[PDB]
Every structure is written in C-alpha cells, then in structure tokens.
C-alpha cells in the first residue's frame, strides 16, 4: 500500500549519497537517526580517554594518533547521521580510511626499533588515501569506499593472524575477539540494510529495546567502535611485549640506579632512581636468573632469590619514604643497606 512515510523530515533535507534504515528524527527533530548518532559515543568518550592516558603515560605518537583517529571517526559518524548531508558525510567516510591506514602503519612497525620511520610504507599509506579520497569525491559511488576500507581491514587482519599465530599466543583472547565483535558488527549493518524492516518498531515497546534492538545498524557503531577499541590496545599490547625489559636489562636498572643514589647530589636524582629501581627489583622479583634456570620456581634457592628482593623491595620503600618526607641524605645513604642485601641474598644466584 501507499500510507504515510516514517521519515519526518526537519531541518534540512537529505543530500548525502545514503539514507539508513532508521527513521529520520522519529525521536526528536532536533537530530536525524537518533540511536545511529547516540551510538558514536562510545567510539568518541573511550578513543579520547585512551589518548589522554597515552601522553600521560609517555608512549609512541602512532599510538595517540591512533586513538584520536578513532575519536575523529565517532565525531564524525556523530556529524553525519545528525544532519545527513553530503558534506559530513565525507567527515565519517574519509576519516575510516585514514585511521585504518594508521593502524596499518602501527600493526608493521610493532617488532621495529623505538624512535624510528618507515618512509616507504608512510608515503605508500599516504599515496593509498590519496588515491581513495580524489576518486571517492569524483565518482561518489559508497560501494567503492566499502571495497577499499574492506582491504585495509583484510591487511589489517592478517597481521593481527600472523603475530598471535608466530609471536604472540598470549594476545589470542584480545586479538580474536576483537576480530569477532566486529564481524558480528559487520553482519548486522548487512541486517539492517537488507532486511530494512519497520515492523518489529512498528508493532509493540518501542520505547524498550525491541524498539531499539532492530537499529542493527546503531548496534554496528557500538560494536565496530568496541573493536576498534580493542584493535587498538592489541596493537598497543604487541608493542609493550617487544619494549619490555628482561631479567639482565632489570639487574643492570638496578644496578645503574644503585650507583646513581650513592654518587647523587640532588633529591629528584635520588627519588628518580628509587622509582626505577623499585620497578626493576618487582620485575626481576619474578623473574628466574641464569644460576637457577635449571631449578623449578618454587624450589628454596628460588624462594630465597625472591625474599632478597622482597627485602630489597621494602627497604627501596623505606628509602623513598625518608625521600617524600624531605630526608635527602638518609634515603642516599640507603644505597649502602640495598647494595649490602643485594650482596648477601640476591648476588650469588647471577
Ligand atoms: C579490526 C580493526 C578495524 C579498524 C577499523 C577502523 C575504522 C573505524 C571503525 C568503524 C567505523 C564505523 C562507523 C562508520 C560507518 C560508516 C558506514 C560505511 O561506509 O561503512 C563502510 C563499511 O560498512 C564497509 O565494510
Ligand atoms: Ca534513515
Ligand atoms: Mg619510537
Ligand atoms: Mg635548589
Ligand atoms: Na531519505
Ligand atoms: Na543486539
Ligand atoms: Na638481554
Ligand atoms: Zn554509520
């Protein structure tokens, strides 16, 4: 039949290339496919949250610029199911392209050395969403950006494969199901397109999440944003892995910061050296030295290496103590007491 139509059409019409199945401002008129904008949230407050923890942290730009082109993603799905033009449809679409390309960079250079760039896979990336975005705004075809993202995420896939199968198993949960979430993601945006059904709203509740439950498409920002998510902290996961210390890099920490307390001058070179020491002697703690590599790690001569440190560990806190409390001078002559229970209990097993 030919009855009303469900899309109540306020503050502008639709100029951009395609309209989703959820009806435009049945919620409110104030903004267009309402459950497709609100559900950009959690692909705009996580992303940022990740950003900001990122700089705090200290870690690699890839990293920050990795969680902000997710954010640029989510403000700009955000931009585009609100107003649904041309225009901020470009703001959604391109920007997938580029997080992607990022992402691809991040996940090729994890196992490369720190403070270094690959300028042939930059300008490659750079070269690929060029070509993408010029072709995109000539020929405004939405199928061809769906083939290109698709193969970035294809890439993208295999990497993430190739390193939990050959360097990393430990990153099998994370790596898998952030995989899935976002096929599952992917087969509902197919739900909502092609079986683009008003009835199951239509019909009864619409205000509880049956209503709300058939915006597959709402569901596929939720789930897509949730992957990406964890994209990200498997990508940043695989880096920490490659970065982190060993037993002989912790004893040498150890040892550096030890010398550094007994020839310091100044209180921040003390603290400083307490804090690295403190977090090399936890990470040694658990570790298993040369000497003991032999014996099980619950053995006595293991149950003594790990006392030592324990003794160590509390004396570095007493040390730092007497340093947060403005005694300077004790907490230098510290080093002598964790340089002597370094001799007696933890020395003879390296
Ligand atoms: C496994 C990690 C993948 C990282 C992807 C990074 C991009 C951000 C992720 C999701 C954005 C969803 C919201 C934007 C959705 C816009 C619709 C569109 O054109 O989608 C094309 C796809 O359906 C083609 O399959
Ligand atoms: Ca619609
Ligand atoms: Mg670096
Ligand atoms: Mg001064
Ligand atoms: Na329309
Ligand atoms: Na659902
Ligand atoms: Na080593
Ligand atoms: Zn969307």
């Given at each position: 039949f030919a009855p009303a139509a469900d899309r109540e059409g306020y503050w502008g019409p639709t100029t951009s290339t395609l309209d989703w199945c959820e009806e435009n401002y049945?919620?409110?008129?104030?903004?267009?496919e309402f459950w497709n904008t609100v559900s950009n949230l959690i692909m705009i407050i996580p992303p940022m949250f990740g950003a900001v923890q990122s700089v705090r942290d200290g870690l690699e730009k890839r990293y920050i610029a990795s969680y902000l082109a997710l954010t640029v993603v989510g403000m700009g799905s955000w931009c585009f199911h609100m107003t649904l033009k041309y225009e901020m449809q470009l703001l959604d679409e391109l920007p997938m392209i580029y997080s992607c390309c990022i992402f691809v960079y991040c996940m090729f250079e994890c196992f490369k050395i720190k403070n270094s760039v690959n300028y042939h896979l930059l300008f490659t990336l750079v070269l690929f969403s060029l070509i993408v975005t010029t072709v995109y705004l000539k020929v405004k075809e939405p199928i061809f950006h769906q083939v290109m993202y698709g193969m970035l995420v294809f890439t993208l896939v295999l990497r993430s494969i190739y390193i939990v199968t050959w360097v990393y198993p430990w990153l099998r949960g994370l790596g898998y199901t952030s995989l899935g979430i976002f096929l599952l993601g992917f087969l509902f945006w197919n739900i909502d397109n092609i079986?683009?059904?008003?009835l199951r709203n239509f019909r009864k509740k619409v205000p509880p999440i049956i209503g709300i439950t058939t915006q597959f498409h709402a569901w596929w920002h939720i789930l897509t944003g949730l992957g990406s998510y964890l994209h990200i902290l498997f990508s940043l996961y695989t880096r920490t892995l490659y970065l982190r210390a060993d037993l002989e890099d912790n004893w040498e920490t150890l040892n550096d910061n030890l010398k550094v307390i007994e020839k310091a001058d100044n209180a921040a070179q003390v603290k400083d050296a307490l804090t690295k020491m403190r977090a090399a002697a936890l990470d040694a703690q658990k570790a298993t030295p040369p000497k003991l590599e032999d014996k099980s790690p619950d053995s006595p001569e293991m149950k003594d290496f790990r006392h030592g440190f324990d003794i160590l560990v509390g004396q570095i806190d007493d040390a730092l103590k007497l340093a947060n409390e403005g005694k300077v001078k004790e907490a230098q002559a510290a080093a002598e007491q964790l340089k002597t229970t370094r001799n007696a209990y933890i020395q003879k097993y390296l």
């Open positions: 049945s919620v409110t008129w104030y903004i267009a079986f683009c059904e008003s």
